[PDB]
Symmetry: C7
Amino acid sequence: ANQALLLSYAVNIVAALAIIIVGLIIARMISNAVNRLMISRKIDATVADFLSALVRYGIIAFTLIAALGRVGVQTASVIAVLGAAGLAVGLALQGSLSNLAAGVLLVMFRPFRAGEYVDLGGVAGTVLSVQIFSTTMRTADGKIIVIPNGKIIAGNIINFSREPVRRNEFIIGVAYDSDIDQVKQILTNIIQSEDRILKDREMTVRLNELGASSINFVVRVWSNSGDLQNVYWDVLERIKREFDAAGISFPYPQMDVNFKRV
Amino acid sequence: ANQALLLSYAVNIVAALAIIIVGLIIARMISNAVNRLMISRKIDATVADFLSALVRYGIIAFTLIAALGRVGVQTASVIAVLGAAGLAVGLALQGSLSNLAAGVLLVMFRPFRAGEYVDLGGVAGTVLSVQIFSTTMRTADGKIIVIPNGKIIAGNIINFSREPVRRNEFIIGVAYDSDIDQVKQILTNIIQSEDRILKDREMTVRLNELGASSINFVVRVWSNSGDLQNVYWDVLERIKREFDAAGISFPYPQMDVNFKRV
Amino acid sequence: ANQALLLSYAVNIVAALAIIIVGLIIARMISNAVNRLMISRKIDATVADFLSALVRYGIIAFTLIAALGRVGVQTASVIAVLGAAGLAVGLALQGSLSNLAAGVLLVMFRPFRAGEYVDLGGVAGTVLSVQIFSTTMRTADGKIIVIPNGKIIAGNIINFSREPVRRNEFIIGVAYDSDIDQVKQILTNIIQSEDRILKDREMTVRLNELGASSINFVVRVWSNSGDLQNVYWDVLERIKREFDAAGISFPYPQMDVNFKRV
Amino acid sequence: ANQALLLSYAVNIVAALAIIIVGLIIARMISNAVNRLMISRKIDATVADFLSALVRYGIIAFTLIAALGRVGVQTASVIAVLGAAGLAVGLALQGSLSNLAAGVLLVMFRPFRAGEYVDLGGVAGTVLSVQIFSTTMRTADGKIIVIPNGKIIAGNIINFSREPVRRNEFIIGVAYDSDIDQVKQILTNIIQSEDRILKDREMTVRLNELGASSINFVVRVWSNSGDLQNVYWDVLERIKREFDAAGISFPYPQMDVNFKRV
Amino acid sequence: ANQALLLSYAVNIVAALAIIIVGLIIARMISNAVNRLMISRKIDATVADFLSALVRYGIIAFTLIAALGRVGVQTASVIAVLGAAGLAVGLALQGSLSNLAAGVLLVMFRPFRAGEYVDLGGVAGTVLSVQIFSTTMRTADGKIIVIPNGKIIAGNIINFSREPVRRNEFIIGVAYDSDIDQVKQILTNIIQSEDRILKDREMTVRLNELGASSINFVVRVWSNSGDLQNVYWDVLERIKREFDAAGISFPYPQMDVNFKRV
Amino acid sequence: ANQALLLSYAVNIVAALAIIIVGLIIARMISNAVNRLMISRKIDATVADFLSALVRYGIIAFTLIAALGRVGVQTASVIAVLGAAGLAVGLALQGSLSNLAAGVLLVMFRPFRAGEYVDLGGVAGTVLSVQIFSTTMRTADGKIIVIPNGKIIAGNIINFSREPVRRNEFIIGVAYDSDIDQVKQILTNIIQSEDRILKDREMTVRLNELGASSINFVVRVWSNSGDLQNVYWDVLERIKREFDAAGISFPYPQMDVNFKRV
Amino acid sequence: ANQALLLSYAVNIVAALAIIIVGLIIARMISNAVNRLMISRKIDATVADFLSALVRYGIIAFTLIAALGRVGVQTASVIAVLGAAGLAVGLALQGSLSNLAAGVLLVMFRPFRAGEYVDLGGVAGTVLSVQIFSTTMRTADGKIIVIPNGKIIAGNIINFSREPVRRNEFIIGVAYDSDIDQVKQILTNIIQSEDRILKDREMTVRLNELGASSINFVVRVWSNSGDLQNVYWDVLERIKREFDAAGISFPYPQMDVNFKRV
Ligand SMILES: CCCCCCCCCCCCO[C@@H]1O[C@H](CO)[C@@H](O[C@H]2O[C@H](CO)[C@@H](O)[C@H](O)[C@H]2O)[C@H](O)[C@H]1O
Ligand SMILES: CCCCCCCCCCCCO[C@@H]1O[C@H](CO)[C@@H](O[C@H]2O[C@H](CO)[C@@H](O)[C@H](O)[C@H]2O)[C@H](O)[C@H]1O
Ligand SMILES: CCCCCCCCCCCCO[C@@H]1O[C@H](CO)[C@@H](O[C@H]2O[C@H](CO)[C@@H](O)[C@H](O)[C@H]2O)[C@H](O)[C@H]1O
Ligand SMILES: CCCCCCCCCCCCO[C@@H]1O[C@H](CO)[C@@H](O[C@H]2O[C@H](CO)[C@@H](O)[C@H](O)[C@H]2O)[C@H](O)[C@H]1O
C-alpha cells in the first residue's frame, strides 16, 4: 500500500520503454544516413547495406544496454547475453556471409561475366547470373548448375570466352610407311586454304610422336573463338578426304604375330 | 534461536523464486510478441522461431542472474556458468544449426523444388521434400537418399529439370571406308523427320573423331525435357535400321596382324 | 596460544564444508526436479539427462565458488580454475558429445530404423541398433560394422528398404545381326508373363547402346522390394533360355583381323 | 640498517613457502580422497585418475595464487601466467588426450576385444591389446600394426569375428553351352553333402550374370566362423572335380575372329 | 519546463558531434602522415595502405568511444559493440586479406613474373599479371585462368622459364635384333650435328630399358629454352628418317602365339 | 631545477632495473631446482626441460609485471602485451611443439626402435633415429627419409620387425588340366623338406582360385623373420624346377578363338 | 577567452607527443641491445630479429598506452584497439610466420642442404637454396620449383644424396624354358666383373617371380651414389649383349591360342 516504490518501479519501466523507442528511431535514422552517404560515394550497394546493418544493430545494442540498465540488468549481463545471441546468429550466418563477400568480389573484379563459358572447379557451362549467394550456369546440354560464390572464388576460374582468339590442336596418326614430306605438305595445304585460320599466328605441322601403331602428327592453328569448333570440324573432314585421295593410310591397331605350331 | 537472520534468508529465497516466476512469464510474453511481430512482417517462420527463442532465452538469462544474485551468487559467477552451459549446448547443436540455416536458404532461394531431378554432390534423384535438417530424394531405381541441408548448400547443385529444353548427343562410329556424305545425309534425314526434335535449335551432324577402329560422328539435337529419353531411344533405333538398310557398317574392333611364321 | 584467530579459521573451514554439503544436496534435488519436469513434457530422455547434468554441475560450481570464497580463494581464481578444468573435460568429451547429439537426431528423425538395409558412407548392411555413440550394422556376409553417429549424420544415408517398390535393370547384349523386333518381343513376353513385375509401372524394353561387340538392350521393371532379387534371377535365367531357343546369339568379344603375311 | 622492513619481507617469503607446502599436502590428500571415492563408485580407473589429476592441479593453482600474492604478485598476473603455461601444456597434450578418451571409450563399449579379427580403416588383423594411447594388432602374415585410439574411434570398425556365423560366396563361370539345370544340380549336391554348411540358412545357387566369355553362377552358403575358410577350399576343390567329371567346361577367354585376307 | 537538464543533454549531444568531427579529421590527417612516412621509407604501397587504414580506423574507434561516452554509453559497451562489428567485417574480409598478403609476397619475392610460363597447382600457362587478389594466366590454347593469390603461395610454383637452358628427353624404341652400337652411333651423329644442342652439357645416349616389344634408348640433350620445342621436333624427324635409311626397325607390338588346333 | 621529482623518477627506474635483475636470478635458480627435482624423479629429460622452461618464463613474467609497474605501466597493459607476444611465439612454435610431444611419446612407448623396418604412412625403411622433431629412416635402396614426429604418431605404424616369425605366401598358377593331387603333393614335399619353414605353424597348400587361364594354388608357410626372403626365393626356384621335372605346366594367357572366314 | 583550460589541453598534447618520441627512442635502443645480446649468445639471426621485433613493438605499445592516456583515451580502449590492429596484422602475417619458422628449422636441422637431390612431397630436384619463406630447387630437366617452407617441414623429406652408397635393382625377364643356373651364372659374372659394384655389400641374383610370359630375375647391387646411373646403364647393356651371345631369350608377350573353326 506504500506506493512510493511501486511508482518508481513503473517509472523505470516506462523510461526503459521510452529509451527503446527512441533508440530504434535513432538507429534507423543514422543507419539510413550512413547508407545514403556510402551510396553517394560509389560504394557497392551490397557493401553499403552490410555496413549500414552493422551500424543499425550496434546502435540498437547501445539502446538495449541503456534500457535494460534502467530496469536493473547489469551492463556485463546484457553484453554477455547479446554476445551469446550474436554468436548464435553469426554461426547461423557464417556461410552466407562468406558467399556474400565472394559475390561482391565476383561482381567487382569480373573474372567472368554473364554469357561467358567458364569452368568452375570441374563443372563447365555458360554463366547466367551471379547472385547474392550463388552463381547459376547452364551446361552445353542444358542442365542448370548452381554454385555457391565462396566455392567459386576459392578455386580456379577457367574462362573459355575472355580471349578473342583460341587454338585448335589435331593429332593425326598415319601409317609408319607414310611419306613424311607428303603428309606435312597436305596438312599445310589444308590449313593454308582455310580462311578462318589466322595466318599471322603459329601454324604448326610437325611429326610429334612415334606411337605403337602409327606416327602422330600435331597440327596447331589459331582462330577466332566463334570459329573454333567449325574450323575443327571442317579441317578434320578435309584431312580425312585428302588423305583418302592421296593414299595416306589411317592405321588400324597393329600386331606382329610370331606363329608357333606346337 | 535468533530468527532475525533466518527470516531474512527465507525472504531472499522467496524473492528469488518470485523473480524466477515473473521472469519466465515476461520471457514467454515478450518472445511471443516478437514472434507475432516478425510473422506479421513476412519473416520466414523458421527464422522467426529462431530469433524468438533467442529473445526468450536471453530474458530468462537476465532473470536467472537477478534471482541468483538475490540468493548471493555473484553476477560474474552466473555469467560464467551460463556461458559454459550455453557453450555445451552450442557444441551439441552446432551441426543442427548449420543444417537449419541451410534449409532456410534452400526454401528461400529454391535452387531446386520438390519433383525436380537433381544431382547433389554425386547422388542423383527426384527431390521429395526439403525438411528442417535434411532433404529427401528418390533415385531412379527407387532408393531413398537423405542428405543434410548444409552439405547440399555447400556443394554444387545440378538441376536436370529446371530448363524446359535439353540436348541429346549421339556418338555413332562407322567404318573408315564409309561414305561421309551418305552418313551425314542419312543422319540428317533421321533427325529431320523426328517431330520432337526442335528445328529452331542447333542440329549438329558432323564427323567428330578419327578413332582406332571407326570414324565417329556426333549428332546433337534439342528436345523438350519430357521427350529427351524417348527421342534418344527412337533416334538410336532408327539409326541402326537405316544404316543396316544402306549398307553402312558398324565396325567391330580392328586389328592388322602382320604374320611371321618363325 | 591466542586462539581467537585459530577459532575463526576453523569456523571458516567448517562453513566451507557445510556450504559444500548443502550445495551438493540442492544440486541433486534441483537437477532431479528439472529432469522429471522435462520427462513429463515428452522431451527425449537423452536430452533431458544432458540438460539435467548441466544444471547439476552449474549449481555445484556456484557451491564451489561460495565455499572456496569462505576459505579465502577469490572468485576470479575459482572461475579460472573451474574454466580450465571444464575446458579439459570438454576437450576430452567433444567427440562423444558430437556422437551423442547425432544419435539423438538419428532416433528422432529416423532416416533409417532397425532392420532396414542402408548404405552409410560406402559401407552397407542391415541396421541392428542405434546406440548412444555409434550404430551397429550387419553386412550381407555377416560382418558387424560399428559407425560413430556423428559420421553417419554428417554424410549421405542411402536407405534401400524405405520404399516398398524398387526397379530392376537388365543390360542384355546380343549380336549385331540379331533382329531387333524379335529381341524386343521376346523380352516383352518374358516380363509380361512374370507376375511379380508390376504392370502399372514402367516396363522399358529398348535398344540402348551400340557397343563394341554387341548391341545392348536395357530392360527396366519394378517389383516389390522383397521380390527384387528373385525377379532378377528368374528373368535372367528365362532370358538365357528363351534367347537360346530362339537362336539369338550372345556374342563373344569380336575382332576383325586384317591378315598380312610379310 | 632499518630492519623493520627486511623482517617483514622475509616473513612474507616464509609465509609464501609455508602456503606452498601446506597447499601441496592438501592437494595430494584431497585428490587421493576423490580418487578413492570415484574408484569405490565403479568409475573407470583412467577416468578417475584424470579427474583426480584435475582436482590436484586445481588445488595447486589456488595455492600458487595465494603464495604469489603473499610475495606481491597480483592475482591477475598469476592467473594469466598459469593460463599461458596450461595452454602450452594443453597444446602439447591435446593429441594424447584425444587418444586417452578414445581408449576409454574402446574399453568401455567393446566394439572389438582382444583376439578378434577386425578391419580398422583399411588395415586388418587380430587385435592384441587396447592400450592407453594406441591399439596393437597382428596381421595375418605376422606384421604388427599400432593404431592411435582416436583414429580408431573416429572411423568405421569392421569386426569379422563378432558374429558366430558367416557367409561364403562362390562365383563359378561355365561355358555358354553348359546345361543350366545340370550345373545347378551339381552345385546343389555339393553344398548339400557338406556338413559344415548350415542347412537352415540361405543356400543360394543361381545363374547370376551373362559374362563376356562365360555365364556366372553364384553360390552363397553360411557356416560357423571357424569353418569358413576350410569350407571355401573344400567346396571349391569339389566344384573343380565334379565339373571335370561331368564334362562342364570352365571357359578360357573367348574371341570371335572375323578373318580378312587383304 | 525546467530546461536546466534539457540544455545539459543538448550540450552533451553537441559535444559528441564535435568530438566525432574532430576525431575524423585527426584520423584522416594522422593516417595520411603515416602513409607518406611509410612510402618515403620504401615500404611497399599495399603494405603502407593497409597499415594506414589500421591507424585511421583505430583513431576513429577512440573517437567513437569518447563521443558515445559523452552521450552516456559506457566504454565497455562501445568496445563490445565495435568488437562485434569488427569481427563481422573481419569474417567477411578474411579470404581477401589472405589473398592480399599473398599478392604482396608474390610481387616482393618474384617466384614468377609476367611473361613466364608457370605451373601453379596443376594448371599451366603464361603469367599475365599479379593483381591485388588473384593472378591471371593464359594457357597455351588461349584460355584465361584466374587463381587466388593465397592458393598460389600455399602451393608449389613450377617455373618453366626461369632457367635459360633446359633438357629434352627422347625415348626411342627399336627392335630387339637391332645392333646396339649402330643405334648409339646414329643417335650420336644426329645430336652431334644439331647446332642448337649445347655440347658442353650432358649428351646422354644409352640403352635404358628392355621393354615388352622393344629395347628403349634414352637421349638427353640440353638447349636454350627458346629452342627446346624446335630441337625436339627436328631431332625426332631426323631420327625417323635416319633409322629408316639405316634399316633400324621401329617395332609394332609383338606377340608370340603358340598355336593349338584342338 | 626542482629535482625532488627527477630523483623520484630516477629511483623508480633504478628499482625497476633491480627488480629485473633479481627476478632473472630467481627465475634461473627456481627453474634449475625444479629441473633437478624432476630429473631425480625419473621424469623424461625433454618433459623436464619443457616444464622448467615454463617455470622460468612464468617467473620472468612476474618480474616484468612488477618492474614495469614500478615505471608506471599498468598491470593490464603488461599482461596484454605479454599475452600478445606469447601468442606470436606460440603460433611460431606450435608445429614444433606438436613434433616435440610426439617425439617424447615415440621414445616413451617404442612403437618402433632404431634398426627396425617400419612403414610410416606409406613410406617404408629401416629406422635410424628418433630425434627431437623428426624421425630418420633409410629405405631399402639407400634413400634417407625424414618424417616429422607428429605425422608419425598421428598415423598407422606398421612394424615389420617386431615379430620374430612371419608368413610367406605363394600364388602358383598351373594349367587347368593339371592333376590337383599331384600339385598339392609336390608343393607339400617342397615345403616339408625346407628346414627354415616352421613345422609347428600353419602349412597351407590349397587350391585357391579358378582363374582366367589357370587354377591358382596358395601356399602359406611361416619362418623366422631373418629367413623370410631367402625362404621365398629358395621355395620359388624349387617350385619352378620340380614342376618342370613333373610336367606340370605354367600356363601362358589363354584365348579360345572362334574363327569365322567372312 | 579563459585560457587556463586551453593551456592545460595543449600541455597534455605536448606531453603525449614527448612520451611518443621518448618511447620510440627507448624501444629502438632496448630492442637493439636485446638483439646484440642474443646474437652474442649464438642465437640464430632470424630468431633474434623476431624476438627483437617483439620487444620493440611491445615497448611501443606501452608508449602508445601512456600517451593516449595523457590525451584522455582510456587504457581499455587503447588495449582493445591495439589488439584489433594486431589481430589484423597477425591474420595477414600468419602464413609468412609459419614459413619463417619452418625455414629456421630447415636451416637448423639440415634435413637437406644446397646441392642435394631431394623429393619434397612428390616434386624432386636439386636444392638451390633455403630462403626466408620458401625453398628453390631445380628439376633434372631444368625447371625451377619454389616450395613454401612450412609445406616442406610438414611433409616427408626424401634425400637421395645423403647416403654415400645406394642400391640398383634390375628386373630381367627371360623365357620359361631358360636354364636357371645359366642365367644366374651369367648375371653373377656380369656383376662380378663390374668394379664400381661394391663387393662387400649384398649382391642378390635370384629368381623372383613366375610372370605371365616370363620368369623374372632380380639383381640388386650397391654402388657409390655418383656411380649409380652409369652402373645401371653399363650392366643393362652387358646383360643384353651376354644374353644374346648365350642364346637366352627375352620373351615377347605370349598367348596360347586354342583354334576353333566354327
Ligand atoms: C560476439 C560477436 C557476435 C557477432 C559476430 C559473430 C561471429 C561468429 C563467428 C563464428 C566462428 C567463426 O569461425 C570461423 O570458422 C571457419 C570454419 O571454416 C573458419 O574460417 C572460415 O571462414 C569462412 C566462413 O566465414 C569459410 O568459408 C572458410 O572456409 C574459412 O576460412 C575459421 O575457423 C573461422 O573464421
Ligand atoms: C557462450 C555462448 C553460448 C551460446 C553460443 C554457443 C556457440 C558455440 C560455438 C562452438 C564452436 C563453433 O566452432 C565452429 O566450428 C566449425 C567446425 O567445422 C567451424 O565452422 C563451421 O560451421 C559450421 C557449423 O556451424 C560447419 O558446418 C562448417 O563446415 C564450418 O564453417 C568453426 O571452427 C566454428 O564456426
Ligand atoms: C575484434 C577484432 C576485430 C578486427 C579483426 C577481425 C579478425 C577476424 C578473425 C576471424 C576469424 C579468423 O579465423 C581464421 O580462420 C581460418 C580458416 O581457414 C584459419 O586461418 C586461415 O587464414 C587464412 C585466412 O586469413 C586462410 O586462407 C588459411 O587457409 C588459414 O590459415 C584460422 O582458423 C583463423 O586464422
Ligand atoms: C597467451 C598464451 C601464450 C603462450 C601459449 C601460446 C599458444 C599459441 C596457440 C596458437 C593457436 C593454436 O591453435 C591450434 O591450431 C591447430 C591447427 O592444426 C589445431 O590443433 C593442432 O595441434 C597440433 C599443433 O599443436 C597440430 O599438429 C594438430 O594437427 C592439431 O590438432 C587447433 O586449431 C589448435 O590446437
